[PDB]
Amino acid sequence: APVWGCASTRGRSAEMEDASAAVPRFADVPVRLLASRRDLDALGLDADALRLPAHLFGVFDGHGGAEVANYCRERIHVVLSAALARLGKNLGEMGEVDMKEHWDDVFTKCFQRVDDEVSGRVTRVVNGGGEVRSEPVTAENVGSTAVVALVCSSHVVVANCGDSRIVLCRGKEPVALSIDHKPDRKDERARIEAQGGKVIQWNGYRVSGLLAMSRSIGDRYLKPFVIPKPEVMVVPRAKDDDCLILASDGLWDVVSNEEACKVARRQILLWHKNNGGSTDPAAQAAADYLMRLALKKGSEDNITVIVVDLKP
Amino acid sequence: HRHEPRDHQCSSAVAKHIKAPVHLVWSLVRRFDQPQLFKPFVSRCEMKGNIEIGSVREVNVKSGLPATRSTERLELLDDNEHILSVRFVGGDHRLKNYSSILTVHPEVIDGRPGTLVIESFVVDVPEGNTKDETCYFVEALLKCNLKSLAEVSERLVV
Ligand SMILES: CC1=CC(=O)CC(C)(C)[C@@]1(O)/C=C/C(C)=C\C(=O)O
Ligand SMILES: [Mg+2]
Ligand SMILES: [Mg+2]
């Protein structure tokens, strides 16, 4: 049902700490978060009973280790899918509600839940029942970005935590769907300093002079300055839409938004002109191209690219 | 623990109570060739020869930091008086002329034998920063190290 490609490499680094997830039909989106019950009652349709499939895509740039990025790959889509089914029922005996504010809650409480599992603040289930673990997943200096996009036929919902990024090409011109959580961002400095922390310029603006981002999963040794709260944006799809690009800093450090969009469209069209849970050859070709464009431009970091085609 | 910071330098210290006997803690601190035994930020460490004054370890740190490698020389290692002094003499980091002193002391904690660890340092203030920023940067790392030291120590008692 969903058309995507994923290119991922160790790159010129000794170890791989990037992780990614692409889960088709991972959940059904409660339509009550996309449209009001009254508008649908006027058509005779029951918003609570309406089925709309969604897909999840995620990129997790680990730092200090791969274990938290890997844990995000394995748990976010599961925690999220369960929250959406629970929310779908609680809307039964509920009235109208702020959809913006409910998308914030479900993604925030989801990221917060994976962060709480990673740090040990809650017990977590292994071996699909029977086993439980309560000790932290790993040391307190390991973390990971999380940029995830929930995709259905009518909307793209985006949740970002860290300096990974997702970019939408709408109308052959790029649109940033996330804003990097660099610690020198005016509002992030204000937040960190209000907490009693410091944003120090130390080979780049860093929290406590250490971490080059203001939000992430894990990294409990930098709390409460570094936090897992994501920025959520709900983006109605349009006839203009070209594609979706999720990537780690391994790509965005050497490729601009404009360039990443231009190359993605071209590679998808380029593949269709020459040719009149599995990946799509055209999106894949755009993902492999963007990965190699990052290596050919001198990127020394891990590189992870997901391309999602928004047209056919 | 008396350092004399020069005009172009800062200095501070951090302490930690460990619920383990001195001999147990110090057995971990003294292995100058394996600081990854308690430092969560170390990924690799190389050293030739016996641990002795003048020994040099080449440390590689994990990702997510402002640096990747430092070269460190053992300045002082007293096994009767539990003292360890290290100096950073190379690397690609911004801690020039870093020097630390670490000591372990016996103590009674909750009716059992325990340990107090004290670590102080002096380092040049890098170009563009303040004494306060530099001390904050180091204390955050040291507090984390002594945090890890306490965990591993208290785990060896069981
Ligand atoms: C954690 C880290 C990051 C740097 O930017 C410098 C350096 C690589 C030296 C360091 O290993 C510093 C470690 C410190 C201050 C103390 C220690 O280890 O006892
Ligand atoms: Mg990384
Ligand atoms: Mg990276």
UniProtKB/Swiss-Prot annotation, chain A:
Family as reported in the entry's similarity comment: Belongs to the PP2C family.
Residues of the full protein shown: 58 to 379 of 387
E.C. number(s) listed in UniProt: 3.1.3.16
Sequence motif Modulates binding affinity to PYR/PYL/RCAR abscisic acid intracellular receptors, location on chain: 207-211
Keyword check for Acetylation: no
Up-regulation conditions: Induced by abscisic acid (ABA).
Protein's organism: Oryza sativa subsp. japonica
Binding site residues for Mn(2+) 1: D61, G62
Protein known as: Protein phosphatase 2C 50
Cofactor requirement: Mg(2+); Mn(2+)
Catalyzed reactions: O-phospho-L-seryl-[protein] + H2O = L-seryl-[protein] + phosphate; O-phospho-L-threonyl-[protein] + H2O = L-threonyl-[protein] + phosphate
GO molecular-function terms, A-Z: metal ion binding; protein serine/threonine phosphatase activity
From Swiss-Prot, chain B:
The keyword Disulfide bond appears for this protein: yes
Localization per record: Cytoplasm, Cytosol; Nucleus
Segments for region (START-like): 3-154
Entry GO MF terms: abscisic acid binding; protein phosphatase inhibitor activity; signaling receptor activity
Quaternary structure and partners: Monomer. Interacts with PP2C50. Binding to PP2C50 is dependent on the presence of abscisic acid (ABA). Interacts with PP2C30 and PP2C53.
Residue interval(s) of motif Gate loop: 63-67
Note: Plants overexpressing PYL3 exhibit abscisic acid (ABA) hypersensitive phenotype during seed germination. Plants overexpressing PYL3 exhibit tolerance to cold and drought stresses.
GO CC annotations on file: cytoplasm; cytosol; nucleus
Disulfide bonds: C10-C135
Site description Involved in interactions with PP2Cs, residues in chain: P66, T130
Job description of the protein: Involved in abscisic acid (ABA) signaling during seed germination and abiotic stress response. Acts as a positive regulator of ABA-mediated inhibition of seed germination, and tolerance to drought and cold stresses. Together with PP2C50 and SAPK10, may form an ABA signaling module involved in stress response. Inhibits the protein phosphatases PP2C06 and PP2C09 when activated by abscisic acid (ABA).
Protein name: Abscisic acid receptor PYL3
Annotated residues for binding of abscisate: 39, 67-72, 94-100, 119
Keywords annotated in UniProt: Abscisic acid signaling pathway, Cytoplasm, Disulfide bond, Nucleus, Protein phosphatase inhibitor, Receptor, Stress response
GO biological process: abscisic acid-activated signaling pathway; response to cold; response to water deprivation; seed germination
Ranges spanned by the short sequence motif Latch loop, renumbered to the chain: 93-95
Gene field: PYL3
Family under the similarity heading: Belongs to the PYR/PYL/RCAR abscisic acid intracellular receptor family.
Keyword Repeat: no
Induction context: Repressed by abscisic acid (ABA).
UniProt site (Involved in ABA binding): P40, V138
Gene source species: Oryza sativa subsp. japonica
